[PDB]
Structure 1
Amino acid sequence: APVRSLNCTLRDSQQKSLVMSGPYELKALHLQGQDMEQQVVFSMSFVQGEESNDKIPVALGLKEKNLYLSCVLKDDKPTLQLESVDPKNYPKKKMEKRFVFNKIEINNKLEFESAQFPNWYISTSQAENMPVFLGGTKGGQDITDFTMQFVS
């Protein structure tokens, strides 16, 4: 059958929500009440790739939009971007490497490591309303842990 997907939202471990910052970036911020309608809803697809109990390959597309988080080198650096794709062909089981994230469950938290760039992870800043980016470690000052919420 087609690739399976789930609608969901993500928050960082500081409980910051994710929203759009222009058409090709996301930002993270403290949201509650009416304002959370601003949050982005993702369609998380369970795709092809190396898997284990706690390590699941996924794609993160924006629900009902032909936009996917992807990891590419930009100015010689692994970087996270929102890339447009052909809506007739996505999502699919066999997503290209750049689109794939290893969803890792550790201590009640989730990490999204780039399948393409080992040990690079979806990250947020502690500061409010800063971009979501690709970070070169699960260590450090930045935030690399998230929780997932299921959406109808």
Structure 2
Amino acid sequence: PVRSLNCTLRDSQQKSLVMSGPYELKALHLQGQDMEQQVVFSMSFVQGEESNDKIPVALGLKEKNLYLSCVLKDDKPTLQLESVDPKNYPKKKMEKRFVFNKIEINNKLEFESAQFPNWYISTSQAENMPVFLGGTGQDITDFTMQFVSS
């Protein structure tokens, strides 16, 4: 059965990720009690081409049938949160739209869409803006991961 880890992510400006309605995430500076708003991910280690510093993963919300995915929307590569059938997920052979290449860069991580080369999970420098898929340099594409208890 597919292996997964609970974790949080923060961008390189130490912004945490929170829900923004049902199908979007946003990034903001949180500390103290307000950190509890952050989203916990279940990162699954899925099928795909890999190397030492590039590992295919899927990013689901912990104990929710919701996954980050990359699709064309109005003809542009876009990040979305997508609902799935909870009987069938997670699985090792995730569909390509759900796969990200987790890449080590210096002491940080980037998450490249496997479907759209050189498009990355990104945040803006401004507070309270959506997490999005970026093809680029003001926008932030590097993150750190924090491990969470099972």
Q: Under TM normalisation by the shorter chain, which class is it?
A: over 0.9
Give the distance between the partners of 2:74 and 2:100, measured in 1 at CA.
Answer: 21
Kindly tell me the number of residue pairs found equivalent between the two proteins: 149
Using the TM superposition, give the Cα deviation of residue 48 of structure 1 relative to its aligned residue in structure 2, in angstroms: 0.1
Give the distance between the partners of 2:31 and 2:107, measured in 1 at CA.
Answer: 22
SS at match of 1:37: helix
> Match for residue 129 of structure 1?
128
Q: Residues 82-139 of structure 1: CA distance to partner in whole angstroms, max 9, x if unpaired?
A: 00000000000000000000000010010000000000000000000000000002xx
Give the distance between the partners of 1:148 and 1:78, measured in 2 at CA.
Answer: 24
Give the distance between the partners of 2:58 and 2:43, measured in 1 at CA.
Answer: 6
> Match for residue 142 of structure 1?
139
Give the distance between the partners of 2:69 and 2:40, measured in 1 at CA.
Answer: 16
What is the TM-score normalised by the length of structure 2?
0.99
SS at match of 2:127: coil
Give the distance between the partners of 1:143 and 1:106, measured in 2 at CA.
Answer: 13
> Match for residue 43 of structure 1?
42
Using the TM superposition, give the Cα deviation of residue 5 of structure 1 relative to its aligned residue in structure 2, in angstroms: 0.1
Gaps of 5+ in 2: none
Give the distance between the partners of 1:3 and 1:142, measured in 2 at CA.
Answer: 32
Give the distance between the partners of 1:136 and 1:72, measured in 2 at CA.
Answer: 13
What is the TM-score normalised by the length of structure 1?
0.97
Give the distance between the partners of 2:89 and 2:45, measured in 1 at CA.
Answer: 13
Using the TM superposition, give the Cα deviation of residue 57 of structure 1 relative to its aligned residue in structure 2, in angstroms: 0.2
**Map 1:60-139 → 2, pairs under 5 A:** 60-137=59-136
SS at match of 2:72: strand
Q: Residues 39-68 of structure 1: CA distance to partner in whole angstroms, max 9, x if unpaired?
A: 000000000000000000000000000000
Gaps of 5+ in 1: none
Using the TM superposition, give the Cα deviation of residue 37 of structure 1 relative to its aligned residue in structure 2, in angstroms: 0.3
RMSD: 0.4
> Match for residue 26 of structure 1?
25
